[PDB]
Amino acid sequence: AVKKFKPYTPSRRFMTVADFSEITKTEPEKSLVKPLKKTGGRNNQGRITVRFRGGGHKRLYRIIDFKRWDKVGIPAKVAAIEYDPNRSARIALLHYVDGEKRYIIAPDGLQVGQQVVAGPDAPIQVGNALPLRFIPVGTVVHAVELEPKKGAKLARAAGTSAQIQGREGDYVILRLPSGELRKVHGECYATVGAVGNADHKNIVLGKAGRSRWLGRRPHVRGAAMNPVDHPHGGGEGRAPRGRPPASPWGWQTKGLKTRKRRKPSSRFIIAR
Amino acid sequence: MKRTWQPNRRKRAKTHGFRARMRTPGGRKVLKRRRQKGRWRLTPAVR
RNA sequence: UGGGAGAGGGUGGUGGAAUUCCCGGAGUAGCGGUGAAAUGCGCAGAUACCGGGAGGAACGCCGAUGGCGAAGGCAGCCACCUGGUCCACCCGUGACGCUGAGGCGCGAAAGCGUGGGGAGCAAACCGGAUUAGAUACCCGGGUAGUCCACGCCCUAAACG
RNA sequence: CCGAGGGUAGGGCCCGUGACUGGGGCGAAGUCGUAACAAGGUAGCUGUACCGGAAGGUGCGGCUGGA
RNA sequence: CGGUGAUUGGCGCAGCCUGGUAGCGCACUUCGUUCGGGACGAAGGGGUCGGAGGUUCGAAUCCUCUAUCACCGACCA
RNA sequence: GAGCUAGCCCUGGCCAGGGUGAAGCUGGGGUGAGACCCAGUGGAGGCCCGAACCGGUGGGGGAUGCAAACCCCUCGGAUGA
RNA sequence: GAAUGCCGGCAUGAGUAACGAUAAAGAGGGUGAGAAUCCCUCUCGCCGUAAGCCCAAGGGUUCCUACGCAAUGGUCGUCAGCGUAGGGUUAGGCGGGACCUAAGGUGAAGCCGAAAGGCGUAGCCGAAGGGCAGCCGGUUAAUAUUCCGGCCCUUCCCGCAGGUGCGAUGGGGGGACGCUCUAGGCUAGGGGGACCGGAGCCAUGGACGAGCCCGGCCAGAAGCGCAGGGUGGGAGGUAGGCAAAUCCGCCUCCCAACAAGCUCUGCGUGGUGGGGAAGCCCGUACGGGUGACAACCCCCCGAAGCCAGGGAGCCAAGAAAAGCCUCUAAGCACAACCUGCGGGAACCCGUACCGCAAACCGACACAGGUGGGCGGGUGCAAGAGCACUCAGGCGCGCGGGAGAACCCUCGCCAAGGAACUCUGCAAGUUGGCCCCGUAACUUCGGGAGAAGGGGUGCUCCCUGGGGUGAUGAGCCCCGGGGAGCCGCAGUGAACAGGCUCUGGCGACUGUUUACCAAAAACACAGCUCUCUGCGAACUCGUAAGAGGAGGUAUAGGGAGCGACGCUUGCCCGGUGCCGGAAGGUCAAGGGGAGGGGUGCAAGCCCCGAACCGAAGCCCCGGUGAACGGCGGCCGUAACUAUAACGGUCCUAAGGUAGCGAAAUUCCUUGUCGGGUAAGUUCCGACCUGCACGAAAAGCGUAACGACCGGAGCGCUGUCUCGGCGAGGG
Ligand SMILES: [Mg+2]
Ligand SMILES: [Mg+2]
Ligand SMILES: [Mg+2]
Ligand SMILES: [Mg+2]
Ligand SMILES: [Mg+2]
Ligand SMILES: [Mg+2]
Ligand SMILES: [Mg+2]
Ligand SMILES: [Mg+2]
Ligand SMILES: [Mg+2]
Ligand SMILES: [Mg+2]
Ligand SMILES: [Mg+2]
Ligand SMILES: [Mg+2]
Ligand SMILES: [Mg+2]
Ligand SMILES: [Mg+2]
Ligand SMILES: [Mg+2]
Ligand SMILES: [Mg+2]
Ligand SMILES: [Mg+2]
Ligand SMILES: [Mg+2]
Ligand SMILES: [Mg+2]
Ligand SMILES: [Mg+2]
Ligand SMILES: [Mg+2]
Ligand SMILES: [Mg+2]
Ligand SMILES: [Mg+2]
Ligand SMILES: [Mg+2]
Ligand SMILES: [Mg+2]
Ligand SMILES: [Mg+2]
Ligand SMILES: [Mg+2]
Ligand SMILES: [Mg+2]
Ligand SMILES: [Mg+2]
Ligand SMILES: [Mg+2]
Ligand SMILES: [Mg+2]
Ligand SMILES: [Mg+2]
Ligand SMILES: [Mg+2]
Ligand SMILES: [Mg+2]
Ligand SMILES: [Mg+2]
Ligand SMILES: [Mg+2]
Ligand SMILES: [Mg+2]
Ligand SMILES: [Mg+2]
Ligand SMILES: [Mg+2]
Ligand SMILES: [Mg+2]
Ligand SMILES: [Mg+2]
Ligand SMILES: [Mg+2]
Ligand SMILES: [Mg+2]
Ligand SMILES: [Mg+2]
Ligand SMILES: [Mg+2]
Ligand SMILES: [Mg+2]
Ligand SMILES: [Mg+2]
Ligand SMILES: [Mg+2]
Ligand SMILES: [Mg+2]
Ligand SMILES: [Mg+2]
Ligand SMILES: [Mg+2]
Ligand SMILES: [Mg+2]
Ligand SMILES: [Mg+2]
Ligand SMILES: [Mg+2]
Ligand SMILES: [Mg+2]
Ligand SMILES: [Mg+2]
Ligand SMILES: [Mg+2]
Ligand SMILES: [Mg+2]
Ligand SMILES: [Mg+2]
Ligand SMILES: [Mg+2]
Ligand SMILES: [Mg+2]
Ligand SMILES: [Mg+2]
Ligand SMILES: [Mg+2]
Ligand SMILES: [Mg+2]
Ligand SMILES: [Mg+2]
Ligand SMILES: [Mg+2]
Ligand SMILES: [Mg+2]
Ligand SMILES: [Mg+2]
Ligand SMILES: [Mg+2]
Ligand SMILES: [Mg+2]
Ligand SMILES: [Mg+2]
Ligand SMILES: [Mg+2]
Ligand SMILES: [Mg+2]
Ligand SMILES: [Mg+2]
Ligand SMILES: [Mg+2]
Ligand SMILES: [Mg+2]
Ligand SMILES: [Mg+2]
Ligand SMILES: [Mg+2]
Ligand SMILES: [Mg+2]
Ligand SMILES: [Mg+2]
Ligand SMILES: [Mg+2]
Ligand SMILES: [Mg+2]
Ligand SMILES: [Mg+2]
Ligand SMILES: [Mg+2]
Ligand SMILES: [Mg+2]
Ligand SMILES: [Mg+2]
Ligand SMILES: [Mg+2]
Ligand SMILES: [Mg+2]
Ligand SMILES: [Mg+2]
Ligand SMILES: [Mg+2]
Ligand SMILES: [Mg+2]
Ligand SMILES: [Mg+2]
Ligand SMILES: [Mg+2]
Ligand SMILES: [Mg+2]
Ligand SMILES: [Mg+2]
Ligand SMILES: [Mg+2]
Ligand SMILES: [Mg+2]
Ligand SMILES: [Mg+2]
Ligand SMILES: [Mg+2]
Ligand SMILES: [Mg+2]
Ligand SMILES: [Mg+2]
Ligand SMILES: [Mg+2]
Ligand SMILES: [Mg+2]
Ligand SMILES: [Mg+2]
Ligand SMILES: [Mg+2]
Ligand SMILES: [Mg+2]
Ligand SMILES: [Mg+2]
Ligand SMILES: [Mg+2]
Ligand SMILES: [Mg+2]
Ligand SMILES: [Mg+2]
Ligand SMILES: [Mg+2]
Ligand SMILES: [Mg+2]
Ligand SMILES: [Mg+2]
Ligand SMILES: [Mg+2]
Ligand SMILES: [Mg+2]
Ligand SMILES: [Mg+2]
Ligand SMILES: [Mg+2]
Ligand SMILES: [Mg+2]
Ligand SMILES: [Mg+2]
Ligand SMILES: [Mg+2]
Ligand SMILES: [Mg+2]
Ligand SMILES: [Mg+2]
Ligand SMILES: [Mg+2]
Ligand SMILES: [Mg+2]
Ligand SMILES: [Mg+2]
Ligand SMILES: [Mg+2]
Ligand SMILES: [Mg+2]
Ligand SMILES: [Mg+2]
Ligand SMILES: [Mg+2]
Ligand SMILES: [Mg+2]
Ligand SMILES: [Mg+2]
Ligand SMILES: [Mg+2]
Ligand SMILES: [Mg+2]
Ligand SMILES: [Mg+2]
Ligand SMILES: [Mg+2]
Ligand SMILES: [Mg+2]
Ligand SMILES: [Mg+2]
Ligand SMILES: [Mg+2]
Ligand SMILES: [Mg+2]
Ligand SMILES: [Mg+2]
Ligand SMILES: [Mg+2]
């Protein structure tokens, strides 16, 4: 349900904003175990590290429960689906019968006023959380922990999903969104279903100002530089890179793998 | 046009201030050289 | 009113045969391919065999001069939603009917846009043969496409 | 006031013309190859897409105007 | 003007740097196939090696100078 | 030494006045339901004209100058990067 | 005696340039030894969204008074922002601190680093941000929201009086927030008035008249009145808000659905307090008195300010903590807290003066720069624009003459209009508002203000809507029709687009070489390749640590291309990258065949070959939106010419599509065609592409541009070809 714009001015024939019909009438936020002060920063203690960051709108970090083992066997009522500026996907407010109010990463197909339970019993309906060893093979899933009792760190973007393909011993194999087959411990928790907001891929920013509103500063090409600043830089007009394409620090950027070969996690991966 | 000197008592006292010099080891050597030379104003006068 | 058949259409789910690939075991000096050959693959352990895993596409037998649909077209199975049609009863309305310039909708395959998927096949393209020459026919590879969702395209030996 | 007509400015249609270029037809008996008619030596035809000096080749689907 | 590369059968190239033997393909000619031509099959001819000189027993071959041909350069003003 | 200058963080302030009338709503039309078409409303925009503000295109002056970057005319952005 | 030598002094230019904006001065009277320059008076000019007031930063005596002119003042100077001396800055309510937290700094715990030092949860610091209790007048030569006058509030502390379980740095609520557009009612501010109060005045032809001129306010408790903001009230149950809670949160039925009611602001109105023009009379630089017992009334416009945390829409999703309320905990319930009253206590620092400028930054009394608030009136459609003008403040610290050339800044011109020139450079034409009317092309928005036209002043008559008033008068804002008048001319002055055709590049808004280059350079949405499964990849750092990110393949990093439309062909021989448990080579180490040195020997000490030995390289493949490249010579067709065709050599392969004398073409002004009288430029073609070419992208593209090139119309001192006038020199 992506929205289009009439070309009354340029950079509006292509400009594209997402659909907010799934957002129920909860435009402001909840408080006290809910937004924290987002520390805006483009750098570490001093110098810049990740270049071309800065500006952008001011944000408030909505704290998300990524560890749903705190409330095993405790039901929940979904009352709101809110916007999160710090995430590509949407969030869901959960009222507990216990009384606690938490935010979960809102998955696809979740509707307001739904019964959601986490734990090992936890029947297979969207939003429920389970250990990997109790989820049936072939079902899509997201918010997967990597190691047990460490937090959901896998497949939490917009539109993403992980698929389970089998169980080997205490571990299970997963079809990650990058196509990689990974052995994950069965005791890891994961919330079933896809995350939704899959139209995030289909957004066109339209103009340059939108990129600045998201905090993305302009990206300067290396060939548009001088040799002091970049290996591609220099030369009289429009040099055709004169060498293998590398980064500003000398390492090549065309097909050079840089994964640590002796990683201990290498005996748990199968595919690319 | 806009010249170089745009005074600020806060900036002057915080950068060239006595306490700021005693923080760094390099600033402590500055005053040692000013004491040895005999400067009347070990630090810039700020009010 | 009461029955009946059917690959009629849309959605969701699901089964196995077979191909390719991955893994393990076992096992050797060749395998593919043709009219004959060659490219190609293979002691870096192939083909052939067993076992396990992933993935996609199409449903053998039934099955045909069969069936359905207005046409294009529709074929594993299951469920839901749905159209058309046939028969009997002769129950009601009572001429309400036929065609149809426009318009509107539908419309094979190939093609386009966006995203996904891609086992096999396969334009273009690369080799190896043949020929005088081969941009082909034959062989080994191989990308779009073939598949899904949505929006376009309106063509044909759309033929009885 | 209206007013023939003259003037300014901008449109619509038609005709003549124009370097060059595309395709069409007719010509002297030219060059290159063999497409289709016989199973035309790869059955042929077709819509579409791509490629090739060229007829044309191939891919997807269709027709008997073939077995 | 500079540098360096080569002129070889009718045509397109090998043979040179390690001197004594000039070869390949197309072409041409004769015969064979066809009703004929092309294709195909069998045999055959074809080169003052751009000219001049010496270097040697001996030069397509080694070395100088002209003759064209090709390519590159001619910069800072 | 970032009191000039470049970037970023935190917190405040500024942008006179006019144009254009996007989406969406209400009513009418239209359909089987639509798509869609009319008005009226609506006030969107790295939207227009143009002051404050930020610039610094072209020309003239200035050249031991008012000035170690200026002045006059002209011109750009001016709700946004 | 020399070193563009160093230091100091004095010459030259030279009585020359200059005297710091062309906003402008003249006269009279004083003081004085000495007056263009000081004081006063009259006349004139300038600013008037300031060149006038009020804050902040900065400055530190510059403020006032008296006495002075050696130096400072671009002249003088009796003057001063200067010299000497004295005086002047008064706070519970203004601002900051005994209140709070953000970025950031610091930092017990803890981690790291040869040392010095570097991180760092909690805490603290950190302010125009949040919180907090004063308004109006009067006095000084100099201060006042500080002193005084009136009215009104805030904290504590001690007491009696009345109520309640009191009670924390702990829990909860709240504080609490974006951008744009806005509703209602107020206020600030302003306009008018036949109404009210006033010293006065009929000038020069006319006017004793609702005549002219000036002024008709401010603050103000507790109440009322009018707007508006916040919020439901009970009952159970309860595992969460890291102890406990009656609080909060979550369920469940009951009553409201309202602002009814509670509070909380804002505005009237309020006890009462204060102010009070113009003109005239004076004695000062500056003010005083009267005018006056002043009046202090009614309409209209009306905010961006108030009610404020208002309403609606939208995406880019919009601070923290304390004050405040509630809740309980230990402890305490002879305490304590809440309400009311009374008495008492209420500290440190700043307060002068400049403050778009002669007091700040520019070495200067420098045409520069500098944050926030008020900023009136009239007219021009509106407006902070433009012209003039209130309040207020200035004539810019050298003048007087003359009326050369020439320079700057202006005005005008016959006839011709670009013939000037690199180019219409510059200057000129156009210019606002209302109404007609507007092409190719197109992404259907645009192009558009296309282009090109007509109207534009004043008087009279008729007539339609609103707003405020009651549906009416009046006041205000919009129209319409008709009849006339004048001038050369009616946005009568000032502010205010020249237009069009065509091409190149770039899609565009935008950014950049402060201080010669704003562009076709950069950036930009979008496309592609590649890396990265999280303690990620990458970056800073020796480390710790941090960014990435409190993100997770729709995400993050690197690279190139640069909207969009159509596309992006062949070569993996070399290089880069990717994939290959075979093989060759390969260091340390293992390994000891064997040999050597000493010993009388047990021994000790050296080398030392096979053989086992990683990555890397060699080797095998793959890979172009990776580094990169994409041929030569002969002949051949019914006239020449040409070559669809063929032969041959070589490469890893031999430039496909689409363009092409171009931002690329040397020969070259290639050759045709068009614009011209004439075109080395421009545009359309041919291709003989020295030396286009597909993501260092190719070909197109509506719109867009202080970009570049060509042409035409209008207009002109650009030119023939100059002339005259004005002012500053
Ligand atoms: Mg809080
Ligand atoms: Mg908060
Ligand atoms: Mg820090
Ligand atoms: Mg630091
Ligand atoms: Mg995409
Ligand atoms: Mg870039
Ligand atoms: Mg550069
Ligand atoms: Mg650097
Ligand atoms: Mg540098
Ligand atoms: Mg370098
Ligand atoms: Mg170059
Ligand atoms: Mg380069
Ligand atoms: Mg009957
Ligand atoms: Mg019919
Ligand atoms: Mg179709
Ligand atoms: Mg199809
Ligand atoms: Mg498709
Ligand atoms: Mg195949
Ligand atoms: Mg094949
Ligand atoms: Mg048929
Ligand atoms: Mg034939
Ligand atoms: Mg045939
Ligand atoms: Mg055929
Ligand atoms: Mg083919
Ligand atoms: Mg077929
Ligand atoms: Mg030079
Ligand atoms: Mg700064
Ligand atoms: Mg405005
Ligand atoms: Mg509308
Ligand atoms: Mg704009
Ligand atoms: Mg403008
Ligand atoms: Mg302002
Ligand atoms: Mg410039
Ligand atoms: Mg603009
Ligand atoms: Mg001397
Ligand atoms: Mg000497
Ligand atoms: Mg000198
Ligand atoms: Mg000299
Ligand atoms: Mg002199
Ligand atoms: Mg003189
Ligand atoms: Mg002189
Ligand atoms: Mg002079
Ligand atoms: Mg002066
Ligand atoms: Mg006297
Ligand atoms: Mg101060
Ligand atoms: Mg003097
Ligand atoms: Mg001076
Ligand atoms: Mg005197
Ligand atoms: Mg004074
Ligand atoms: Mg003094
Ligand atoms: Mg404090
Ligand atoms: Mg604090
Ligand atoms: Mg902090
Ligand atoms: Mg520290
Ligand atoms: Mg230490
Ligand atoms: Mg800290
Ligand atoms: Mg404050
Ligand atoms: Mg206060
Ligand atoms: Mg007082
Ligand atoms: Mg209590
Ligand atoms: Mg709290
Ligand atoms: Mg008032
Ligand atoms: Mg009045
Ligand atoms: Mg009166
Ligand atoms: Mg008279
Ligand atoms: Mg508890
Ligand atoms: Mg209500
Ligand atoms: Mg009042
Ligand atoms: Mg009151
Ligand atoms: Mg008075
Ligand atoms: Mg007076
Ligand atoms: Mg009003
Ligand atoms: Mg609101
Ligand atoms: Mg605190
Ligand atoms: Mg004061
Ligand atoms: Mg003061
Ligand atoms: Mg100001
Ligand atoms: Mg000073
Ligand atoms: Mg000064
Ligand atoms: Mg002065
Ligand atoms: Mg100044
Ligand atoms: Mg300013
Ligand atoms: Mg104002
Ligand atoms: Mg105003
Ligand atoms: Mg004014
Ligand atoms: Mg007005
Ligand atoms: Mg106006
Ligand atoms: Mg003005
Ligand atoms: Mg005045
Ligand atoms: Mg002056
Ligand atoms: Mg005149
Ligand atoms: Mg003239
Ligand atoms: Mg004239
Ligand atoms: Mg003329
Ligand atoms: Mg010209
Ligand atoms: Mg000329
Ligand atoms: Mg001339
Ligand atoms: Mg001009
Ligand atoms: Mg145009
Ligand atoms: Mg116009
Ligand atoms: Mg007239
Ligand atoms: Mg204009
Ligand atoms: Mg142009
Ligand atoms: Mg243009
Ligand atoms: Mg541009
Ligand atoms: Mg510059
Ligand atoms: Mg700049
Ligand atoms: Mg410079
Ligand atoms: Mg693109
Ligand atoms: Mg390091
Ligand atoms: Mg980290
Ligand atoms: Mg972070
Ligand atoms: Mg990336
Ligand atoms: Mg580029
Ligand atoms: Mg290659
Ligand atoms: Mg390679
Ligand atoms: Mg290779
Ligand atoms: Mg490798
Ligand atoms: Mg050894
Ligand atoms: Mg060794
Ligand atoms: Mg050894
Ligand atoms: Mg190795
Ligand atoms: Mg390519
Ligand atoms: Mg001939
Ligand atoms: Mg040309
Ligand atoms: Mg040309
Ligand atoms: Mg070229
Ligand atoms: Mg001509
Ligand atoms: Mg002509
Ligand atoms: Mg010509
Ligand atoms: Mg050409
Ligand atoms: Mg190029
Ligand atoms: Mg390239
Ligand atoms: Mg480009
Ligand atoms: Mg082009
Ligand atoms: Mg382009
Ligand atoms: Mg264009
Ligand atoms: Mg621009
Ligand atoms: Mg021109
Ligand atoms: Mg003159
Ligand atoms: Mg004059």
Author numbering:
A (entry chain RD): 2 to 273
B (entry chain R7): 1 to 47
Text taken from the publication that reported this structure:
The m1G37 modification also prevents the ribosome from shifting out of the three-nucleotide mRNA codon frame (‘frameshifting’) to ensure the correct polypeptide is expressed. The absence of m1G37 in tRNAPro causes high levels of +1 frameshifting on so-called ‘slippery’ or polynucleotide mRNA sequences where four nucleotides encode for a single proline codon. We further show that ribosomes bound to mRNA-tRNA pairs that result in +1 frameshifts promoted by tRNAPro-CGG result in large conformational changes of the 30S head domain, consequently biasing the tRNA-mRNA pair toward the E site.
Although the m1G37 modification was previously shown to be critical for high-affinity binding and decoding of the cognate CCG codon at the A site, its influence on the overall conformation of tRNAPro-CGG in the P site appears to be minimal as the tRNA adopts a P/P orientation. Similar to the structural studies of the ASLPro in the 0 frame, the mRNA used in these studies contains an additional nucleotide after the P-site CCG codon. The mRNA has clear phosphate density for the single A-site nucleotide indicating the mRNA remains in the 0 frame. The absence of the m1G37 modification correlates with a slightly weaker U32-A38 pairing when compared to modified tRNAPro-CGG. These structures suggest that the absence of 1-methyl modification on G37 alone is not sufficient to destabilize the tRNA in the P site of the ribosome.
